[PDB]
């Protein structure tokens, strides 16, 4: 089938001048030996497959990227809507998964999960219809709303979702909307030609903004809503793999880190998880 | 209209489904894709690449390069053990952070043979012979060469070619093992001993070092995608 792992051909005893157990890693060449070259083996028909380790199967799983909150009633208009500059560096799990590769190119499937609640205080609603939320995506350059009740929410060309509670989470598909021929997870360079300004990948990040608000005016009480954004990469292509990260993440715009140990300690070089008394192995 | 009927699983969001969805940007003109070298199609292309294994990961050595060096000395070393560790590619302080263990940590089930390449980084006039043994489970770990010769062993003679490969085969009662290893899916022990000893001429340094690399064979497989227990955060990064 596709793509079944290799079989172990039967091998017997031998006494030859062609030794494949000895190699030279100084050439940057990983040895392509198999168990049959160092011992006698049997013929097994291996039906195992590598279908679940492919890139399209490794990355096509929705993961949270942002959690935002916004109020519905009033007070400090900045609190009546939420905004987000699109990243993949705010949640560590998908960030590391993406950072396994230097370059990526994929279509996206975006899901929005909005959960509301009732805020405490005096003058509660005691009865209210369902809440309708609006999510509007502004490409780089367009006007950005300054309040829940603002003219910028018409979205004559900006795509938007009007979503009512009690339904399935909102969802769409987005093509490969980058400027270059692939998404650059890393960038060893600057923004200006004089080598100053912004260093790292932050300069190439020009994706846009997402704003979310309550369509309802309410006016009898306060209700707080939380929006969670989920990203599913499909049709994924990846180039130039990298080692996985060791240090915990610190910033969402840098690769800054603190020096961490390579692994976890163990008692001795001959430690095999036993009590290990003293003599000829432990002194 | 057409009479339908809604079944369980309606209006749910399962994070591992395959459904179509409308495009927010109709008729978008995607920029052409070019040829970029080094394309990955499968993660096992990465686990099949040699990576240096920190066998000497004691308390002091984890914070230096000394974790990667296995020391060898040229006296009467017939009763000393060069190194020894459990065979646990996913859950073991020696293997869990290498280019192989990192890949296995995003999966719960693994199965296959594993290559361990040992490289002698001594002088060109230093010669020796070592015994690299693998012992399947069911008995206590070997305590000496006389006990460790009874397993799958290779006798490595250091000479003009510097690297020797020990291939840990697949011997288990189950098709797959668990990355989070237990007492029921144990995989044995890997040990090293002096066959004859390290001998140097007058002038060469008397102590040498060995480096260890680990990769996967062409019959290694992983399944059951999970989260890795290596990265975590307290609050949203800003």
């Amino acid at each position, epitope marked *: 089938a596709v793509a079944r792992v290799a079989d172990t051909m039967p091998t017997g005893p031998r006494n030859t001048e062609s030794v494949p157990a000895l190699t030279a890693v100084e050439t940057g060449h990983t040895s392509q030996v198999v168990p049959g070259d160092t011992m006698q083996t049997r013929h097994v028909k291996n039906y195992h497959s590598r279908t679940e380790s492919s890139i399209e199967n490794f990355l096509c799983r929705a993961a949270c990227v942002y959690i935002a909150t916004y109020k519905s009633a009033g007070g400090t208009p900045t609190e009546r809507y939420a905004s987000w500059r699109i990243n993949t560096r705010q949640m560590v799990q998908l960030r590391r998964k993406f950072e396994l590769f230097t370059y990526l190119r994929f279509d996206m499937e975006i899901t929005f999960v909005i959960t509301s609640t009732q805020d405490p205080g005096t003058q509660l609603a005691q009865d209210m219809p369902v809440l309708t939320h609006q999510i509007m995506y502004i490409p780089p350059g367009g006007p950005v709303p300054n309040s829940a009740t603002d003219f910028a929410w018409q979205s004559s060309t900006n795509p938007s979702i009007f979503w009512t509670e009690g339904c399935a989470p909102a969802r769409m598909s987005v093509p490969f909307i980058s400027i270059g021929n692939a998404y650059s997870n890393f960038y060893d360079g600057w923004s200006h030609f004089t080598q100053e300004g912004v260093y790292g990948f932050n300069s190439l990040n020009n994706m846009g903004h997402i704003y979310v608000r309550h369509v309802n005016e309410q006016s009898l009480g306060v209700s707080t809503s939380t929006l969670r954004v989920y990203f599913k990469p499909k049709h994924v292509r990846a180039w130039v793999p990298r080692p996985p990260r060791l240090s915990p993440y610190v910033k969402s715009s840098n690769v800054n880190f603190k020096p961490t140990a390579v692994t976890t300690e163990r008692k001795d070089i001959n430690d095999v998880g036993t*009590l290990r008394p*003293v*003599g*000829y192995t432990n002194h | 209209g057409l009479p339908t009927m809604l079944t369980p699983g309606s209006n749910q969001f399962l994070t591992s489904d395959d459904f179509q969805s409308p495009s927010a940007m109709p008729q978008f003109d995607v920029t052409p894709e070019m040829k970029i070298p080094g394309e990955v199609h499968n993660l096992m292309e990465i686990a099949e690449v040699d990576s240096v294994v920190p066998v000497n990961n004691t308390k002091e050595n984890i914070n230096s390069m000394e974790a990667y060096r296995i020391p060898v000395t040229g006296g*009467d070393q017939l009763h000393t053990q060069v190194f020894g560790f459990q065979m646990q590619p996913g859950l073991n302080s020696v293997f869990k952070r290498t280019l192989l263990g990192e890949i296995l940590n995003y999966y719960a089930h693994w199965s296959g043979s594993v290559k361990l390449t040992f490289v002698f980084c001594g002088s060109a006039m230093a010669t020796g012979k070592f015994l690299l043994a693998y012992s399947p489970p069911g008995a*206590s770990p070997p*305590q000496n060469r006389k006990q460790a010769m009874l397993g799958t062993h290779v006798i490595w003679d250091v000479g003009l070619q510097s690297s020797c490969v020990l291939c840990i085969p697949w011997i288990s009662q189950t098709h797959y093992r668990l990355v989070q290893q237990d007492e029921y899916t144990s995989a044995g022990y890997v040990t090293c001993w002096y066959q004859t000893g390290l001998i140097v001429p007058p002038g060469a340094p008397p102590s040498c070092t060995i480096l260890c690399f680990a990769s996967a064979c062409n019959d290694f497989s992983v399944r059951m995608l999970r989260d890795t227990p290596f990265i975590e955060q307290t609050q949203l990064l800003q």
Partner: antibody
Amino acid sequence: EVQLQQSGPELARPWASVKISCQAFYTFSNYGMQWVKQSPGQGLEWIGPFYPGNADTSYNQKFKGKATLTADKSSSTAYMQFSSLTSEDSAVYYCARVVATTDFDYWGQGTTVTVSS
Amino acid sequence: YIEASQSPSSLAVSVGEKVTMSCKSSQSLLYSSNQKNYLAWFQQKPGQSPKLLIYWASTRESGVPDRFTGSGSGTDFTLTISSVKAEDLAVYYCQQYYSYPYTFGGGTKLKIKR
């Protein structure tokens, strides 16, 4: 045969850390030897091993920093380095040797210290 | 610091009878690989150096009479004597050599009751 002749009396004032010494009648490769502190007011305790044929040395946690060991291959004699000699350090220090991986095959006579000033 | 303590402090058993000393540890001293119990029994009289009597907690040092017999395993060890002599007044120590640091037993005196 393998009698471990120790040093003579070393009674002195405190802060005069004495190097207690022992001799041996066996080859100094692939064996070990230890010093154990004996005072009838403290029972028995242990200080640290020196392991010829392996070139390594440990110490008791209560005596960490307090004591140090070293030996000479071509001298057939091993002595102790001591630090911050006190009045309570009065004990009949011994010497013991290891023929096997462990256990004490032989014992020394026992040299006592009388820290008085 | 593993403690191989002893009980009781003394027995004052009379000459011509049996005696059974005991030694209890805080952690097992049996190596499941080579099947050995890491305990030794030592004899100490006031004035001279102590002498090893039993090694591996079940085998007797050469030059020692048959009166001493070691037994026990795991954590708990015993030393049985069938007929003691009045010259055996001493404090016997159950010394462990399993790990670091080496810790000797609490001893057991021999008083005068005849």
